[PDB]
Chain A
Amino acid sequence: EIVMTQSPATLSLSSGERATLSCRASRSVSSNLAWYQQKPGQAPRLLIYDASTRATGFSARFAGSGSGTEFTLTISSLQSEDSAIYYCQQYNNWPPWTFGQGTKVEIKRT
């Protein structure tokens, strides 16, 4: 029912710089939005919930933003371990709990 559109599809930047990811919902989800990180060969991990607050596993370098129909995630001073796929997910009152198609991050080293 509610469709989640995530962009860009792939992102690549060098270490020591800021990175930004975006997500859009086909209807307003009233801040019922979460973000996940999946490292290669492992189960996904919760990064942010209610579009605004970060889980115990992550530090001040990760920030959430937006409300209603458009949302944003920002990573500060990118590092080697950030090379992973990220997905947005809505949870507005009724099933199904649709995920975004995801964004892949790879690091533009020398």
Chain B
Amino acid sequence: QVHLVQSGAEVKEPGSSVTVSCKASGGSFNNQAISWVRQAPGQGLEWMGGIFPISGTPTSAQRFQGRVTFTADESTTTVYMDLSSLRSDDTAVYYCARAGSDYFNRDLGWENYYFASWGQGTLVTVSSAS
């Protein structure tokens, strides 16, 4: 089946950076955008950004625009997300998701940008503890 598969959990020290990845089980990376959404403990959902796997246009939420970068590879059929300058507050579950959207108009923007399918979620925690 098509479904997304994510990388394992991580502990990182403050000021460090973390890499999370997401791969399609079906090898079927069509141009539908892959997006990253996070969930802090006992808190609501938060969109961070995304990328079109073939056309390669990346996008990021304003709060993360200096801190996050996205890249993709059709060969590994995997999307990679890097989050920099980590702090305790970034401790959250990070989910990759597949959007209903597959084209961007210079003038009119996006269409159908809702999440149809989600990954397993990766727990990332920021701490000094061993």
User: Within 8 Å by CB, do A and B touch in the complex?
Assistant: yes
Task: Check B44 for interface membership: any CB of A closer than 8 A.
Answer: yes
Q: Identify B112's interface contact among A91, A98, A102, CB under 8 A.
A: A91
Those 5 A-B pairs whose CB atoms lie nearest each other, nearest first:
A43-B118, A34-B114, A91-B113, A99-B45, A93-B109
Question: Size class of A's contact patch?
Answer: 20 to 34
Q: Within the assembled complex, what's the spacing in Å between the Cα atoms of A101 and B116? A: 20
Interface centre among A43, A89, A91 (most CB of B within 10 A): A43
Cβ contact of B118, chosen from A45, A89, A96, A97, cutoff 8 A: A45
User: Closest CB-CB distance, B2 to chain A, in whole Å?
Assistant: 13
Query: Chain A, 46-58, contact with B by CB distance < 8 Å: what is the 0/1 string?
Result: 1001000001000
Given A49-B114, A93-B110, list of 4 further CB < 8 A pairs? A43-B120, A91-B113, A93-B109, A99-B47
Tell me whether B44 and A94 are in contact (CB under 8 A): no
- Min distance, Cβ B45 to any Cβ of chain A, angstroms: 5
- Is B59 among interface residues, defined by CB-CB distance under 8 A? yes
Given contacts A93-B108, A93-B109, A95-B59, contact A101 B44 (CB under 8 A): yes
Tally of chain B residues near chain A (CB < 8 A): 23
**26 sampled A-B residue pairs with Cβ under 8 A:** A34-B114, A36-B115, A43-B95, A43-B121, A44-B45, A44-B115, A45-B118, A46-B116, A49-B114, A89-B45, A91-B110, A91-B114, A93-B110, A93-B111, A94-B110, A95-B59, A95-B61, A95-B110, A96-B47, A96-B61, A97-B47, A97-B113, A98-B47, A99-B45, A99-B46, A100-B44
Chain B residue nearest to A1 in the complex (CB): B62
Chain A residues packing against B (C-beta within 8 Å): 34, 36, 43-46, 49, 55, 87, 89, 91, 93-102
Whether A44 contacts B109 by the Cβ 8 Å rule is no
- Are A49 and B100 in contact (CB-based, < 8 A)? yes
Tell me if B119 counts as interface (CB < 8 A to partner A): yes
C-alpha spacing A101/B45, complex, angstroms: 8
Nearest CB in chain B: distance from A31 CB, A: 12
